[PDB]
Design an enzyme around this catalytic site. Structure first.
Site, short mmCIF file in Angstrom:
data_model
loop_
_atom_site.label_atom_id
_atom_site.label_comp_id
_atom_site.label_asym_id
_atom_site.label_seq_id
_atom_site.Cartn_x
_atom_site.Cartn_y
_atom_site.Cartn_z
N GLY A 1 34.39 23.52 23.93
CA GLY A 1 34.97 22.29 23.61
C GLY A 1 34.79 21.66 22.30
CD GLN A 2 38.06 17.49 18.78
OE1 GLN A 2 38.87 17.49 19.58
NE2 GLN A 2 37.97 17.12 17.44
CD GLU B 1 41.25 22.05 19.54
OE1 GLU B 1 42.61 21.91 19.73
OE2 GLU B 1 40.62 21.12 19.50
CB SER C 1 33.34 16.69 26.99
OG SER C 1 34.53 17.25 26.91
N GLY D 1 37.60 16.89 28.26
CA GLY D 1 38.68 17.85 27.68
C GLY D 1 39.00 19.06 28.56
CD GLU E 1 38.73 11.10 29.11
OE1 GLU E 1 38.15 10.02 29.68
OE2 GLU E 1 38.59 11.13 27.82
CG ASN F 1 28.60 14.09 17.84
OD1 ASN F 1 28.44 14.02 18.97
ND2 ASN F 1 29.64 14.30 16.98
CG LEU G 1 14.75 24.21 29.14
CD1 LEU G 1 13.89 23.80 27.74
CD2 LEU G 1 15.86 25.04 28.72
CD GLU H 1 6.23 22.02 32.87
OE1 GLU H 1 6.20 20.80 32.33
OE2 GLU H 1 5.61 23.09 32.51
N1 GTP Z 1 29.87 12.17 21.90
C1 GTP Z 1 30.78 12.67 21.30
N2 GTP Z 1 32.04 12.89 22.28
C2 GTP Z 1 33.07 13.50 21.59
C3 GTP Z 1 33.14 14.17 20.52
N3 GTP Z 1 34.33 14.60 19.99
C4 GTP Z 1 34.97 14.64 21.39
N4 GTP Z 1 34.32 13.85 22.05
C5 GTP Z 1 34.63 13.60 23.28
O1 GTP Z 1 35.33 14.72 24.11
C6 GTP Z 1 36.44 14.01 25.16
C7 GTP Z 1 37.44 15.17 25.39
O2 GTP Z 1 37.06 16.46 25.18
P1 GTP Z 1 37.23 17.26 23.82
O3 GTP Z 1 36.16 17.99 23.27
O4 GTP Z 1 37.91 16.41 22.76
O5 GTP Z 1 38.40 18.46 24.47
P2 GTP Z 1 37.99 19.78 24.53
O6 GTP Z 1 36.59 19.85 25.40
O7 GTP Z 1 38.28 20.61 23.28
O8 GTP Z 1 39.24 20.40 25.67
P3 GTP Z 1 40.70 20.59 25.12
O9 GTP Z 1 41.43 19.42 24.98
O10 GTP Z 1 41.41 21.52 25.93
O11 GTP Z 1 40.59 21.42 23.76
C8 GTP Z 1 36.84 12.78 24.48
O12 GTP Z 1 36.82 11.94 25.42
C9 GTP Z 1 36.04 12.54 23.32
O13 GTP Z 1 35.40 11.14 23.57
C10 GTP Z 1 31.77 13.91 19.82
O14 GTP Z 1 31.83 14.19 18.61
N5 GTP Z 1 30.88 13.21 20.16
N1 GDP Z 2 -7.16 14.62 30.96
C1 GDP Z 2 -6.03 15.32 30.35
N2 GDP Z 2 -5.17 15.45 31.12
C2 GDP Z 2 -4.05 16.20 30.91
C3 GDP Z 2 -3.86 16.93 29.48
N3 GDP Z 2 -2.73 17.38 29.38
C4 GDP Z 2 -1.95 17.31 30.39
N4 GDP Z 2 -2.90 16.58 31.33
C5 GDP Z 2 -2.27 16.33 32.71
O1 GDP Z 2 -1.91 17.40 33.14
C6 GDP Z 2 -0.74 17.14 33.99
C7 GDP Z 2 0.33 18.15 33.51
O2 GDP Z 2 0.27 19.44 34.15
P1 GDP Z 2 0.68 20.64 33.11
O3 GDP Z 2 -0.33 21.88 33.36
O4 GDP Z 2 0.80 20.35 31.84
O5 GDP Z 2 1.96 21.14 33.93
P2 GDP Z 2 2.46 22.65 34.12
O6 GDP Z 2 2.55 23.55 32.61
O7 GDP Z 2 3.58 23.10 34.70
O8 GDP Z 2 1.46 23.48 35.07
C8 GDP Z 2 -0.45 15.73 33.63
O9 GDP Z 2 -0.31 15.13 34.75
C9 GDP Z 2 -1.18 15.12 32.64
O10 GDP Z 2 -1.83 14.00 33.05
C10 GDP Z 2 -5.37 16.51 28.58
O11 GDP Z 2 -5.13 16.94 27.61
N5 GDP Z 2 -6.15 15.67 29.26
MG MG Z 3 39.56 20.15 22.20
#
Ligand code: GTP
Ligand code: GDP
Ligand code: MG
Ligand code: GTP
Ligand code: GDP
Ligand code: MG
Lengths: 434, 429, 429, 434
Positions: A10-11, A64, A133, A136, A176, A221, A245, A247
């Site tokens: 989207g935009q 678009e 979003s 849109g 919306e 943005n 990610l 986690e």
């Molecule tokens: N935070 C943020 N929101 C944006 C931005 N540009 C558009 N929007 C939001 O996007 C919402 C609508 O979605 P759009 O991205 O404009 O439209 P689209 O996803 O391209 O979908 P189409 O209209 O079919 O092309 C609006 O409510 C805007 O507030 C941006 O640069 N930053």
């Molecule tokens: N004492 C100590 N604790 C740590 C340190 N780094 C992370 N922790 C602890 O380790 C925990 C995070 O676990 P972690 O091994 O990083 O997560 P995982 O990667 O998903 O296995 C948290 O509760 C932190 O408090 C460190 O350098 N010293």
């Molecule tokens: Mg658009």
């Protein structure tokens, strides 16, 4: 070697990525040409060619060609692989059915073909970053088409979404409430954790906290780019306490329906207020739990935090982290749920958030991205159902959707599922018996 | 003779262990390269326990670094003392644990455990007589809790006679560094009571207090907290590495400290701990090192020993000191704190006196306490576990990875078995 | 005394052998010209086995280069160590084999075999006492499979007492580098079980794993794979060229390794194999060289030895080492892997210890394994042969060159005879 | 000393050779005068005079003098021996009977006289490279006359053909279904391996992969020249794993009827996409098995590969070759036939494919010419029979062929043989029993 590709639909999705990938080139010294003058830290978002040209792992897609041709002619023309910049001919045009059935079905195989060419050269692909979003038609329709396809081809990958949630009083389009309900019925069983972001709540922050009377989408943005640069900070940079990610979805999603946290960044200051405060890790942590600094228009005092995630970065000492968080569990305005005594995930990175030239944030030494999953977002879905129940009871705008490949009964399927989702916050937000 | 394979799981164990091998390289005079550069031959007398000598008279650590994300491995190999480890030992995944026990114990960790055990078994064949394995990890993470406790289960099967001492960071009482750490700790204590001979419970809240109150560091990083654990980690195995007037090993500190095979959850402690200013205002004496250990504000676990009774206490000493001055003070704390020790174990202090102090110190200590004060450590977690599990929240991330609710019921029943046991022997007479 | 004529067939054998003569010239101190430039006289003590000394004190290799296309000969004679071979030895055709066994064994190769045998016989008369002939080739090509196995049949007739050890690249399990390589390999194993005293089965898939996993070469060319074979080729004949505390030759490694005259299909192996970074993190010891050979990831054939039993094992060592440290480790792998060795051959390890290491190394090894793990090497090919032959596809290119379907039936029956024999003695007790 | 002469029949055959022999002079430093300023690598295609003038081993033959007189007056006027440039007076004119009986019988003895003068000075003659088409009357008629004669005089030589197969929807002549069936009945028992190439499938590649909206026949002849320069790369240049013309017919022709593989070259990029991707040997190998990058309009997913031939060249490492090919045997979209577990022939050369000035390909470091013999070309012959069965049932255009020396019953002889050829892919493409 922990690669992670990102999708911009989207935009709204592309214009966020124009500030994100501008920010990533500054964090890694990458020129807009893809080169860097004079460290395998780029690898999670940058694949490198045979020369010293680093190209991003991004898929910019819009139905678009308007927003992409500004990217294709902008400053970061030479940065992007031109096959990644995927366009259509006509937009989905604030129509979920055009984004999912009419126009989206044309180039859905072209985008997945470009996802797969990135995923083949990713030896350690962790997951996806879908920037879209809810308002849109492309960001609601084509994303919901794409999240079905990625859950088939990949499935186990951590598919993170970064939605632009529609504001209660600000809505720049009429339908919306239709696009948001229809995209949430689809992506609920396919996304893993979707981070809600609102426009009106960042209008307030750019006015109050940054002292800008007239902020643009360019200004909004930049702040959403600092959120994602704080979430993906542990992959790109070595931190004291790292986070993956996988986690985020583990520590924030207690039930597979409820995966809608809200992002909150701090500090948000200007250069005139870079002085006049020292910004310790306890000064910026109480900023996040303040209801004025959140980036979704909800009152967190009207709900209970199910799980929080404080993503510290910069000159942050882990002892003072414990001094900052232990005060918050004593407070009554920040209240948790009865089943959750352990409601924090902490990540510390050694990199301060950098400042983009022309940016409206001050160069700070530390920051925090609170990713709080709370009960208070049920009031947001209660508004959006009430905006849906007013319009659909008169069957307004339904002929734009039925005439593009959608059953009229499918609106009742999305509303009954959202009413099933609304009681899920009611079932979890109450306290246990015995 | 009595070699130890050090295993590092999680981000936490890789960051503690990278400071641990900074201390062991200093205590044995080892450069960043891996070559000996000390002056005394007492450093090389038991160099073999934590080192394998390679060609060219270079000593490489017998450390196995395990993670599920490659971010921590880059922090090790590019930091100082990173070129000293063998590149064969760095066994890391790509996806990350996902802050998930089930993704670390069943999904991603079970794919990588055979890559580790083939390095564990390769190190354990080069050992002449194997002492046992130590693991450094956490309980709130995913790799330290899932992948770490998977390795303990797959080693105790292959090495049932050896000692398995874990240095496990326990979730703090006040702050929660992870939303699902009641789930991750409880599923690991299920794996620690059945497969470790001893386990060293460390809280992050307690080390925050020690760096702030005792060391007067207003801004301690993780590397300051890791220096406190690493001096404790080297202090448990210091009579095994250096001569002493009354030696001990990891079995003497397990036979004397574990009266019942489930009750092996220890709280550590270290002395002396002075600031930079307040180090000239204090004399280093054995009565000063004794009274610094046995209080509450020096426990590296955040539980008050006054709310329980010590079953057994180990106080490993370092430095040229006299045995009567030791034996007076170990008796002295048993007279004045006779209610704070358990009754039906008479003379419940094990004393080990090494001869080599740490670097830059005249003498030192290391407290190893096996008290009933950690029943509050598990009454807190099992309360935080049951409060989350009664609404079944955050459960589909673990049920969805090949688990049922029965595993959570059995792990919470196993913890409340152990809570009742520390409740029993505290009141038993 | 005990001279060896090296024969090179195919593109593969010409490219392996050109790296083989790069190693032998380095181990004997021979320049690109052909003149001796080493320092020790131990290099010239058995210089005669791979060299004929010409006038002017120049040593020319006793190598015979055979191909059916002139492209590989230009790569040899214009590359380094190309001006050292005699131009009389370069016997090459013009047409190319056509990736065809029948065009290499009947049509074009039979026209050229008399040009080779007149050079084979000319070299074999200048030899004082002939040891035997070694051939380097492939099984999936046309010259290496057709012309190469034609030479073995025409030499074993003329030299029935000599040893005929072939270094034959076997088609890999995963990738197929040739569409008709099930046909070309099966028609060559028909010729190898009847005319070779021993045969060294090498897979390209296995050397890809060794260069990637073990040597950490992310981009290995053919010249990196050829350096692995050439160090193995010189390692089998190194006690014949240099003195040693327990010598062997190509007959000691054939008498001890071939219990039944069909079962002579070997898998090679080499140790040490370290990266450029990981070479200072490892000590060169006989227990390290032993444990590196006897696993699965060091086999230069892509078949797991754990799916079979070793009948006989040869471990030729190089370098100044002690015999007890050898004899302990050869016993050590027979205790712990007693199921992995065959039962009815007690003490099934042949040990050869040379005194000269390779260039730049302190000590080395060479594994020669005769296991039943290569029954999977031929269960795969005979399955790929029968799947193609049951539809008679790609057959008219071989039937059209003077062959019937009976040759394919007899060669597939001869392979399934040998598959049953390795199935027999693996389960025989 | 592994000489190989090449024959160019028809307008399509000569215009391909105008780009082939332009490419060969660049690969060997040969001037258009035949000289080279400041290595016996030319010898397979270039015979040298007493001076430093290298002349090609080519026979350019067309029954019309139009295309040859552009060669006789072009830039490569001084390169070619003028007796090799053989013309007629009137073309065969999209008539197989004029190419085989009327006009072809006149100068068939003149061309064979010039083949023999090349073959006498070739001491190591491996085979023939007949460049022709299936649609034109010269490329169908005179080739089929010539392949009969070369099978008599030479027989055992590896006679490779490089046809221009007619596209399903694109056909620039009306009687292309007549010329293609009649030339295939003749060359089936005489050719050894004929490499099919289509016009429409290279129209797609020049538009999509090379980003040219308007490609010419000049652009299509550059891509077919890179195919032949990759096939004959192992003779001209020293490679790590070499391959001969006898090895192509061995590894790709399981049955003497079926000898029709399809060429596929990769990478096909422009200079703007020479960056933005690194083009490893696994990136370009998955390009070849993609159905969009093949140069015959067939769906290889609708058939089974009987035998493939990956002709790597340039900076190609053989370990990563095995890493690239072993993934493809695991995939289901690339499926082989039941009798063929070993379906690959790999050739590695050390020379990168050079770039012709004015060419539309980018200077890459590695390439691959997949020569895949597949079952999926039976759908091509099923189309061409159906185009033949519509026209011949009304006996259209038959009087142009009977009136030039052909029996009307000979059309039934070519159609029954093609129907016998159509079931050969059916007999081989099925799986075995027990
Ligand atoms: N935070 C943020 N929101 C944006 C931005 N540009 C558009 N929007 C939001 O996007 C919402 C609508 O979605 P759009 O991205 O404009 O439209 P689209 O996803 O391209 O979908 P189409 O209209 O079919 O092309 C609006 O409510 C805007 O507030 C941006 O640069 N930053
Ligand atoms: N004492 C100590 N604790 C740590 C340190 N780094 C992370 N922790 C602890 O380790 C925990 C995070 O676990 P972690 O091994 O990083 O997560 P995982 O990667 O998903 O296995 C948290 O509760 C932190 O408090 C460190 O350098 N010293
Ligand atoms: Mg658009
Ligand atoms: N790929 C490619 N195809 C060509 C080229 N020139 C002509 N063709 C194809 O050739 C087919 C017809 O064959 P032609 O070569 O034109 O005719 P011919 O072989 O000379 O036979 P006559 O018409 O009798 O002279 C057409 O379908 C064209 O698509 C070319 O330069 N490149
Ligand atoms: N290990 C190795 N194998 C090679 C090399 N060159 C070619 N091969 C293998 O040899 C086979 C090709 O046989 P080849 O002799 O070139 O075919 P021929 O010319 O028709 O006899 C292929 O399966 C390749 O895997 C090389 O340098 N090293
Ligand atoms: Mg024409």
């Amino acid at each position: 070697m922990r690669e992670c590709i990102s999708i911009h639909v989207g935009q709204a999705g592309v214009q966020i990525g124009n500030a994100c990938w501008e920010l990533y080139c500054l964090e890694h010294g990458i020129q807009p040409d893809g080169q860097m003058p004079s460290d395998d830290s780029f690898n999670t978002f940058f694949s490198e060619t045979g020369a010293g040209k680093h190209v991003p792992r991004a898929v910019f897609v819009d139905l678009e060609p308007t927003v992409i041709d500004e990217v294709r002619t902008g400053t970061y023309r030479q940065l992007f692989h031109p096959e990644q910049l995927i366009t259509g001919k006509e937009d989905a045009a604030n129509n979920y059915a055009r984004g999912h059935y009419t126009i989206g079905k044309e180039i859905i195989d072209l985008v997945l073909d470009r996802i797969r060419k990135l995923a083949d050269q990713c030896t350690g692909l962790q997951g996806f970053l879908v920037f879209h979003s809810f308002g849109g038609g492309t960001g609601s329709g084509f994303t919901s088409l794409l999240m079905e396809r990625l859950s088939v081809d990949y499935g186990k990958k951590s598919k993170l979404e970064f939605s632009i949630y529609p504001a209660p009083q600000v809505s720049t389009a009429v339908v919306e409430p239709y696009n948001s309900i229809l995209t949430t019925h689809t992506t609920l069983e396919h996304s893993d954790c979707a981070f809600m972001v609102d426009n009106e709540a960042i209008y307030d922050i750019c006015r109050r906290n940054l002292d800008i009377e007239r902020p643009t989408y360019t200004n909004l943005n930049r702040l959403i780019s600092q959120i994602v640069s704080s979430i993906t900070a542990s992959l790109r940079f070595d931190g004291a306490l790292n986070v993956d990610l996988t986690e985020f979805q583990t520590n924030l999603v207690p039930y597979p329906r409820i995966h809608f946290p809200l992002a909150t960044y701090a500090p948000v200051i200007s250069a005139e207020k870079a002085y006049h405060e020292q910004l310790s890790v306890a000064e910026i942590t109480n900023a996040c739990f303040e209801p004025a600094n959140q980036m979704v228009k909800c009152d967190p005092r009207h709900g209970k935090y199910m799980a929080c995630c404080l993503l510290y970065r910069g000159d942050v000492v882990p002892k003072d982290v414990n001094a900052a968080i232990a005060t918050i569990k004593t407070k009554r305005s920040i209240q948790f749920v009865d089943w959750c005594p352990t409601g924090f995930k902490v990540g510390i990175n050694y990199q301060p958030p950098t400042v983009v030239p022309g940016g409206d944030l001050a160069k700070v030494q530390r920051a925090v991205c609170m990713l709080s999953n709370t009960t208070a977002i049920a009031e947001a879905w209660a508004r959006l159902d009430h905006k849906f129940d007013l319009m659909y009871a008169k069957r307004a705008f339904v002929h734009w959707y039925v005439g593009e490949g959608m059953e009229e009964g499918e609106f009742s399927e999305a509303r009954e599922d959202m009413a099933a989702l609304e009681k899920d916050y009611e079932e979890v937000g109450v306290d246990s018996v015995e | 003779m009595r070699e130890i394979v050090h295993i590092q799981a999680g981000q936490c164990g890789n960051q503690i262990g990278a400071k641990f091998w900074e201390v062991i390289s200093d205590e044995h005079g080892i450069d960043p390269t891996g070559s000996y550069h000390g002056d005394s031959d007492l450093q090389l007398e038991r160099i073999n326990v934590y080192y394998n000598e390679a060609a060219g008279n270079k000593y490489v650590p017998r450390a196995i670094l395990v993670d599920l994300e490659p971010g921590t491995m880059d922090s090790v190999r590019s930091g100082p003392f990173g070129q000293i480890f063998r590149p064969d030992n760095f066994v890391f995944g790509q996806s990350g644990a996902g802050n998930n026990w089930a993704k670390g114990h069943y999904t991603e960790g079970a794919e990588l455990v055979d890559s580790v055990l083939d390095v564990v078994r390769k190190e354990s064949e080069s050992c002449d007589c194997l002492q046992g394995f130590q693991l450094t990890h956490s309980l709130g993470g995913g790799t330290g809790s899932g992948m770490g406790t998977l390795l303990i289960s797959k080693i105790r099967e292959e090495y049932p006679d050896r000692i398995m001492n874990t240095f496990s960071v326990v979730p703090s009482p006040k702050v929660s560094d992870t939303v699902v750490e009641p789930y991750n700790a409880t599923l690991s204590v299920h794996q620690l009571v059945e497969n470790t001979d001893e386990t060293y419970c460390i809280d992050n809240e307690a080390l925050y207090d020690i760096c702030f109150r005792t060391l007067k560091l207003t801004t301690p990083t993780y590397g300051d907290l890791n220096h406190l654990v690493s001096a404790t980690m080297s202090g448990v195995t210091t009579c095994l590495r250096f001569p002493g007037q009354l030696n001990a090993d990891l079995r003497k500190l397990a036979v004397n400290m574990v009266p019942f095979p489930r009750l092996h959850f220890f709280m550590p402690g270290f002395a002396p701990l002075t600031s930079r200013g307040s180090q000239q205002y204090r004399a280093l004496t054995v009565p000063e090192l004794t009274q610094q250990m046995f209080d509450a504000k020096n426990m590296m676990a955040a539980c008050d020993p006054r709310h329980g009774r010590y079953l057994t206490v180990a106080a490993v000493f370092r430095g040229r000191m006299s045995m009567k001055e030791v034996d007076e003070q170990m008796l002295n704390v048993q007279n004045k704190n006779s209610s704070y020790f358990v009754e039906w174990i008479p003379n419940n202090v094990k004393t080990a006196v090494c001869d080599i102090p740490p670097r830059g110190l005249k003498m030192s200590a290391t407290f190893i306490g096996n008290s009933t004060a950690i029943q509050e450590l598990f009454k807190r977690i099992s309360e935080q576990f049951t409060a989350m599990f009664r609404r079944k929240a955050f459960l589909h991330w673990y049920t969805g990875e090949g688990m049922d609710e029965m595993e959570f019921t059995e792990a919470e029943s196993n913890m409340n078995d152990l809570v009742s046991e520390y409740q029993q022997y505290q009141d038993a007479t």
